[PDB]
Design a protein around this nucleic acid. Structure first.
Lengths: 149, 107, 348, 148, 148, 148, 50
RNA sequence: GUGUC
């Protein structure tokens, strides 16, 4: 189980600066286990997220538990039951611009990470040890699912 | 005369094939690309015109795995032949029944 | 034995214009015979000749000796001559239509599928590309729909295949940079291409425009060889225009219409401007208007009301921007910067 | 709630105040991860149907259900060009004494359609201007103006 | 065709041949070949009387009928077919959330209008055979190609 | 007698001159609904810089006139406004200002954005490419100096 | 219209032409289309090798 | 001398 990161987030704000696009909107989330600011963009036409909802976000690679790492992705083939059928939102992007917090000039331990899913941006902040992997160049799959309780 | 030519890629021997069709337009290109996209064994399929003052169309077909790109071409072409055959067979009967019914109700 | 044959394809032929001012007004290209009884050439190289394409008649020369046929190919070469000796900016980048198409393609709003992606990259295998395998990048969003993102379509011009060693790296801002964040911008006007694939931002007049630095083709020619810069300049001119034609870009009279809430916004400004300007008349007649600059009475009054009139126009233009839509064709062209500016919008 | 808008996105096309959404036709395998469509020929035969709304002397109005835009556009494109018919090509003028041009007269005569069955006639070989019996129709015109 | 005066004469002999519409416009066997997507007008909330009567005028006549039954002045869609799309509902934003305009993307209304050379009901049936004439001619040479 | 070809200069009677580009057949040039094809494709990129608004007004007035059946006055410092003409374009059934629903022909898919259609008075100018075309290799020379 | 910069500098060239230009976004960056009517007039001398 | 760039 190559899980890079997994947590439960709640949306505090959504699209604060009016509205510019017609299919994409900004999302502001927060957590309870570890203090962290998660910002991403998701399609509203497909995934109609609203205000004040709790979802589960998982960043990982190698969907199939069987293979070490496969060459090419096949759309309808289901040889190995992966983690995508249990969730409801899948993305495939890459990390870049590994920088940290610049406000605290002296000793701090807060690190940030930027991911680009082919145009849609994602910003993560949090603890140093919480980010275990998250290499500079890494192809990572994002998984989102609504948790209504 | 020259009906069609085959250009295979230098690297891929029988994976990426471009058929060059002579004296054709976007009519048979769009229907054929639709018929080949209906096939699940095809990754990339697409037609393009060389020049608007010419009639040479390059149509590329790529299959996922080790499979020649010549079989899906004729498969989709025969499937389109059957589709138009059935479309004509149904249209003829609809026209006939509507016409006979109108002639009956008129007089 | 000397034999003089007709013009065949693959000839170093000179093509130029008569009003020559700079040294790039004449160039040498490869000849191509086409039965249409007219001269034809790419629109990207129209800026060096400064043609207007309505009444221009350009001329053409044919070298006779073999010693000069090789000298006009290495010095007066289209691939070699891409920057200008005056400053050093690339003169051949793109024109209005291609810029608008590239801007409408990458908008963080476009979403294709598996079938349209195979068609947009189908019009790109036309020349020396028929013996080249094209790859399909992995799709981003596939739990529900497996739909494609338009920004990954644009990254195919840079790296068309796996064998081509093209790894571009650019990081710059646009003409609409909102600020308050380097790459968390509000209007996504920040281009960051890493390893020859677009990550963020929309292509505008400052990224792939003619007469600017930090250009895509310019950096591509500086990092890699110059032959790779010209092979990727025509690939965009075959990808952007067809998609723009199949998308639909048009302007009507409904685009430029004053809003009802806008007519009363400028009415207040015009009334206040008139009430304020028509006071300085009797103010001067009574004897007033203390003067800071060394000048005469009518001179200070000439500039005191000249700043009162520009305020009305500026305020009206600024209130008009909040009254327009997000699909206004003139506003779209102004944001892109192909042919137009905000001044023309505020004037119309 | 969202799955419904998802199946409605591909079924119908929505019209807005500015712009049209859901334009591309997505019914191919691999696109949707809930359904499967490869050919379904026997199922396609029972879903396709043709109706006739109105039929006039020289106009026919019909309806097609269960078909895409590709084959329909192909039909509409070949209805104009690839369907052959007869028209005037060559003209011998003996004595033109009028105001209209000879070229304009020939053009207007070629614009005149002909009520004839093109199925019986052949296709002309690469080139011949003498004119055989099977692939050339003769027409004569003669009129002179006189006073009353 | 032409106008004559006393002292004028015209004598011509023209040849009619077979051709396709791709060569010249005079070989077009059909005058108008077009189709239209089926309209769809879906209401969301029940309307009041005056709003219904004002919406009946915003559309083309014969789209939304106002039924007035003893207490109610409701609107009802009866036949959306005879409706030219003008999307005039977004003119007044008073209602602005009462109608949804859509186009069913499997329904096509073809309207052929022939010049008079041949019946238009046969032109569509001939176009279907012409479409497969090339699908067969290409397979004919593909047979010899794969024969090698 | 000459026909227009690639390289002929046309005007828009509004200070917009241009040489012809690509000659497109009738399978392309999409119709919107009724089957009307664009006779001359105009580029929307030359409008803002040239800053010509009278062109769209003239197109609108011409469309309204050809629909109604009366010539509209467009004199300077007066003529007709855009308030009484657009409300008259609604009675027929078209959109009120300029927009129409178009169906692309090369693909067969509708256009996301709407296109501006209408009749315009165009004019053909001189300086054809037939006369503005010269070439010489070895011809006569002068007697004073041996030069072309 | 003299002989120093009128004839010596000018020296009108042969094997040339001039024609109205038209757009064609189907060629490369270093390509240009020449009509066949002009190509038939222009000739290029070359010596025959083996 | 007129016309276009």
């Amino acid at each position: 189980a190559g899980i890079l990161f997994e947590d439960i987030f709640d949306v505090k704000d959504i699209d604060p600066e009016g509205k510019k696009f017609d299919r994409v909107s900004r999302l502001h989330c927060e957590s309870e286990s570890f203090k962290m600011d998660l910002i991403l963009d998701v399609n509203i036409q497909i995934y109609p997220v609203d205000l004040g909802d709790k979802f589960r976000l998982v960043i990982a690679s190698t969907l199939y538990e069987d293979g070490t790492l496969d060459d090419g992705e096949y759309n309808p083939t289901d040889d190995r039951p992966s983690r995508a059928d249990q969730f409801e939102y899948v993305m495939y992007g890459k990390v870049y611009r590994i920088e940290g917090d610049e406000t605290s000039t002296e000793a701090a331990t807060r690190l940030s990470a930027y991911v680009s899913y082919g145009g849609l941006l994602m910003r993560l902040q949090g603890d140093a040890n919480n980010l275990h992997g998250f290499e500079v160049d890494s192809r990572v799959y994002l998984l989102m699912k609504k948790l209504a309780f | 005369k020259t009906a069609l030519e085959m250009v295979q890629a230098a690297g891929t021997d029988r994976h990426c094939v471009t058929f060059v069709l002579h004296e054709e337009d976007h009519t048979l290109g769009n229907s054929l690309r639709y018929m080949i996209m209906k096939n699940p064994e095809v990754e990339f399929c697409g037609y393009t015109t060389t020049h608007p003052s010419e009639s040479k169309i390059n149509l590329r077909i790529q299959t996922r795995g080790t499979l020649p790109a010549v079989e899906p071409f004729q498969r989709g072409l025969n499937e389109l032949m059957n589709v138009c055959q059935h479309v004509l067979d149904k249209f003829e009967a609809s026209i006939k029944d509507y016409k006979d019914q109108k002639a009956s109700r008129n007089e | 034995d000397i034999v003089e044959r007709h013009l065949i394809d693959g000839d170093v032929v000179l093509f130029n214009r008569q009003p020559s001012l700079h040294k790039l007004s004449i160039m040498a290209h490869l000849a191509r015979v086409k039965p249409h009884r007219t001269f034809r050439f790419n629109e990207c190289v129209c800026t060096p000749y400064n043609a207007d394409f309505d009444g221009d008649e350009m001329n053409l020369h044919l070298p006779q000796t073999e010693e000069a046929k090789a000298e006009a190919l290495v010095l007066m070469g289209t691939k070699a001559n891409l920057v200008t000796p005056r400053n050093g900016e690339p003169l051949i980048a793109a024109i209005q239509d291609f810029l608008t198409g590239a801007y409408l393609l990458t908008l963080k709003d476009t979403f294709f599928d598996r079938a349209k992606a195979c068609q947009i990259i189908a019009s790109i295998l036309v020349g020396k590309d028929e013996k080249i395998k094209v790859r399909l990048p992995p799709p981003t969003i596939l739990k529900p729909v497996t739909l494609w993102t338009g920004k990954q379509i644009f990254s195919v011009i840079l790296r068309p295949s796996d064998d081509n060693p093209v790894r571009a790296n650019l990081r710059t801002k646009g003409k609409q940079y909102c600020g308050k964040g380097e790459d968390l911008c509000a209007n996504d006007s920040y281009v960051t291409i890493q390893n020859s694939e677009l990550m963020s931002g929309s292509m505008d007049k400052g990224t792939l425009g003619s007469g600017s630095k930090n250009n895509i083709f310019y950096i591509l020619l500086r990092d890699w060889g110059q032959n790779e810069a010209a092979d990727a300049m025509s690939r965009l001119a075959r990808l952007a225009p067809v998609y723009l034609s199949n998308r639909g870009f048009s302007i009507g009279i409904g685009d430029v219409t004053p809003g009802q809430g806008l007519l009363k916004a400028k009415y207040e400004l015009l009334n206040a401007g008139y009430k304020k300007c028509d006071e300085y008349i009797e103010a001067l007649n009574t004897g007033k208007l203390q003067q800071q600059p060394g000048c005469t009475a009518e001179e200070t009054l000439e500039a005191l009301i000249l700043k009162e009139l520009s305020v009305i126009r500026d305020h009206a233009g600024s209130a008009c921007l909040r009254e327009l839509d997000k699909s206004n064709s003139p506003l779209t062209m102004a944001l892109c910067g192909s042919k137009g500016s905000f001044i023309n919008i505020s004037q119309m | 709630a969202a799955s419904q808008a998802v199946e409605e996105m591909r079924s119908r096309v929505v019209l807005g105040e500015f712009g049209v959404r859901n334009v591309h036709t997505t019914d191919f395998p691999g696109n949707y991860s809930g359904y499967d469509d490869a050919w379904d020929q026997d199922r396609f035969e029972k879903n396709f149907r043709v109706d006739v709304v109105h039929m006039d002397e020289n106009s026919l109005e019909f309806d097609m259900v269960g078909i895409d835009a590709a084959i329909a556009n192909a039909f509409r494109r070949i209805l104009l060009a690839e369907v052959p018919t007869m028209a005037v090509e060559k003209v011998l003028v003996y004595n033109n004494t009028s105001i209209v041009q000879d070229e304009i007269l020939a053009h207007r005569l070629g614009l005149i359609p002909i009520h004839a069955d093109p199925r019986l006639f052949e296709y002309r070989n690469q080139g011949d201007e003498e004119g055989t019996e099977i692939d050339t129709l003769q027409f004569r015109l003669q009129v002179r103006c006189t006073r009353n | 065709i032409a106008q004559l005066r006393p002292g004028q004469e015209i004598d011509l002999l023209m040849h009619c041949v077979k051709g396709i519409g791709k060569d010249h416009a005079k070989f077009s066997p059909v005058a108008t070949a077009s189709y239209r997507l089926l309209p769809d007008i879906t209401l969301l909330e029940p309307v009041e009387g005056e709003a219904a009567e004002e919406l009946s005028r915003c559309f083309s006549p014969g789209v939304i009928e106002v039924q007035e039954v003893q207490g109610k002045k409701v609107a009802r869609v009866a036949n959306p077919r005879l409706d030219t799309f003008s999307r005039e509902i977004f003119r007044n934003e008073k209602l602005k959330k009462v109608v949804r305009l859509a186009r069913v993307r499997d329904h096509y209304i073809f309207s052929v209008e022939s010049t008079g050379v041949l019946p238009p009901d046969v032109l569509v049936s001939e176009a279907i055979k012409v479409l497969m004439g090339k699908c067969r001619r290409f397979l004919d040479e593909l047979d010899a190609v794969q024969m090698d | 007698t000459r026909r227009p070809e690639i390289g002929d200069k046309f005007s828009s009677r509004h200070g917009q001159k241009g040489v012809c580009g690509l000659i497109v057949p009738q399978e392309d040039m999409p119709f919107c609904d009724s089957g009307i094809c664009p006779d001359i494709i105009m580029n929307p990129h030359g409008f803002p810089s040239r800053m010509t608004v009278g062109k769209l007004i003239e197109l609108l007035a011409g469309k309204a006139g050809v629909l109604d059946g009366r010539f509209h006055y467009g004199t300077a410092f007066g003529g007709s406004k855009v308030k009484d003409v657009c409300e008259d374009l609604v009675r027929h059934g078209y959109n009120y200002l300029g927009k129409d629903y178009v169906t692309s022909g090369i693909t067969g898919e509708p256009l996301e954005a709407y296109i501006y259609f209408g009749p315009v008075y165009y004019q053909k100018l001189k300086h054809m490419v037939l006369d503005k075309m010269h070439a010489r290799a070895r011809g006569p020379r002068a007697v004073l100096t041996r030069q072309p | 219209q003299g002989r120093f910069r009128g004839n010596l500098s000018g020296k009108r060239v042969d094997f040339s032409g001039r024609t109205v230009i038209s757009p064609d976004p189907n060629l490369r960056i270093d390509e240009v289309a020449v009509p066949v009517h002009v190509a038939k007039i222009l000739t290029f001398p070359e010596k025959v090798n083996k």
